Amino acid sequence: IERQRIRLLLALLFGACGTLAFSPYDVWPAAIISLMGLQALTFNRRPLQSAAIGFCWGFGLFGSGINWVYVSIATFGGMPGPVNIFLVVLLAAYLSLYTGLFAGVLSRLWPKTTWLRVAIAAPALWQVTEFLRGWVLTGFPWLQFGYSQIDGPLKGLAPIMGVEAINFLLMMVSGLLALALVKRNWRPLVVAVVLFALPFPLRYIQWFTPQPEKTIQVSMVQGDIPQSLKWDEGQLLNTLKIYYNATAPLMGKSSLIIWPESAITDLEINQQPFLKALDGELRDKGSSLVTGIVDARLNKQNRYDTYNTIITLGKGAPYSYESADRYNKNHLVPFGEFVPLESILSSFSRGPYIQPPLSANGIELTAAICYEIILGEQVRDNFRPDTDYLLTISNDAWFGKSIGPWQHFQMARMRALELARPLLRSTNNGITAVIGPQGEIQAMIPQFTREVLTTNVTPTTGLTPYARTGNWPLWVLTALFGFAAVLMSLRQ
Ligand SMILES: CCCCCCCC/C=C\CCCCCCCC(=O)OC[C@H](O)CO
């Protein structure tokens, strides 16, 4: 009943089981079953056989939860049908090389099924595997099972140690469950249930203190403009008319107005009179505007540097082309925004890794453009104690009518819970919502519409343990399990 081909096919099923645990489905027990399969199917196999089981397990997970990038390739790349499919398969195969490396190293150094393998060696080795997947070649740390516990019992662990710590606990509990199920021993099962029920009383603790006196009315415009690679005439006039006519009635009623990523589809240097006239009108009616735009700035080398920029206008933030109250994108998308090859004979420019928060009407907002919100370590480093709200703008017009924007929206909720700060997410047509300090959704408008999300938000001024330390304590605990497990395997 173990021809390994059965384990290869079962790894495909247990791998795709994890996709059913994210935002479009919200079934967090699917993560435990997905990890138990990867933990169990790697028992008593060759280092190369276990590596193939891990590679096949990762191929089923990424083949189901990442395939939504095909339409993104079927829109920007222009390649034929079969070529776009091969690029998605090669992406899923590359992302599966890390999970196969995890099961390969776990079997080469721990061939036997011991409680140290599944509860000590597996979680420690899993943190190093997922790190390399989300760091190598400007990594893609997508589909992390810690993002599923945003609404579950283990939510109280994120503000203490981070989302990557929940990934450490899920592998430890599922390892004990897979061990207790094969050996038919009730002892690891009880330890697993205990270690899983312990983090529950942590969700009823609030490291933040809301300030109802500083409650303000915020508005976020959802433009829902059609996508066209060609910059035509009139498209800018129609886009500017749509965003203004939805913003003009808000002035004098909402203090903070937010436009999504690259709302002004023109260069910043070309819309100087449009921004000057809009800044002066906002200052008169007592309001501010935070909008995304593309900035083509001249370097002192007399060269042009293109940035994916966030600019501020209005009261408390007078607009100026040389103002430092802006935000430039740091970590860029590998293919869509730059070219990985340095010399081959259109590329954007990266911003600073740490940028000061945006100030509008005295409100501090640490910005993160689109993909940057899923990087919990970088967001915490940019985070500051005086930050009132977390700001995230994105253009999820790509991969529409898919599970992509939901997985992206779910990872953004974790940043609010990690830092105990409200999240302001404004999109062109994606998931425009307001997330509370505990990851709770306070407001949300539907997708694919041209509406305006207007609600009231209250700032907090807490300091979670993760905000002070970050993933730094997790690597300490990871090194302790790693050194103890390797020394135990080398204790021969
Ligand atoms: C012992 C470690 C000290 C580190 C220096 C503390 C500087 C910030 C001080 C207070 C704000 C505490 C919360 C601020 C959280 C974001 C700032 C931060 O983490 O600084 C990064 C660190 O300096 C390198 O990565």
Author numbering: 7 to 351, 363 to 509
What do the authors say?
Lnt performs the last crucial step of lipoprotein maturation in Gram-Negative bacteria by N-acylating the terminal cysteine of incoming apolipoproteins to form the final mature lipoprotein. In the case of Lnt, the nitrilase domain catalyzes the attachment of a fatty acid derived from a phospholipid to the alpha-amino group of the N-terminal cysteine of the apolipoprotein creating the final mature lipoprotein. In the second step, with Lnt now in its thioester-acyl intermediate state, the alpha-amino group at the N-terminus of the incoming apolipoprotein attacks the thioester linkage to transfer the acyl chain to produce the final mature lipoprotein.
Construct 2 (Lnt-C2) contains only two additional residues on its N-terminus left over after cleavage of the His6-tag used for purification. It crystallized in space group P6422 using the lipidic cubic phase (LCP) method and contains 1 molecule in the asymmetric unit. Similar to chain A of Lnt-C1 the full 345–365 arm could not be built but appears to extend parallel to the membrane similar to chain A of Lnt-C1 and other Lnt structures crystallized using the LCP method. The crystal structure of Lnt-C2 is remarkable in the fact that despite crystallizing in the lipidic cubic phase, it’s substrate binding portal is devoid of any bound substrates. In this crystal form, despite high B-factors in this area, W237, located on the opposite side of the access cavity to E343, can be seen in the upward position coordinated to T271 (5C-left panel). Also, despite crystallizing in the presence of 400 mM Ammonium phosphate, no phosphate molecules could confidently be built into the model. Due to this accessibility, the entry of any number of chemicals used during the purification and crystallization process could deacylate the thioester intermediate in the absence of the second substrate. This is especially relevant for Lnt-C2 that crystallized in an open conformation that exposes the C387 to the surrounding environment and took 6 weeks to crystallize. In chain A of Lnt-C1 and Lnt-C2 this arm is positioned at the membrane interface creating a highly open active site cavity which allow the entry of any number of chemicals used during the purification and crystallization process deacylating the thioester explaining why this extra electron density is not seen (or at a very low occupancy) despite mass spectral evidence.
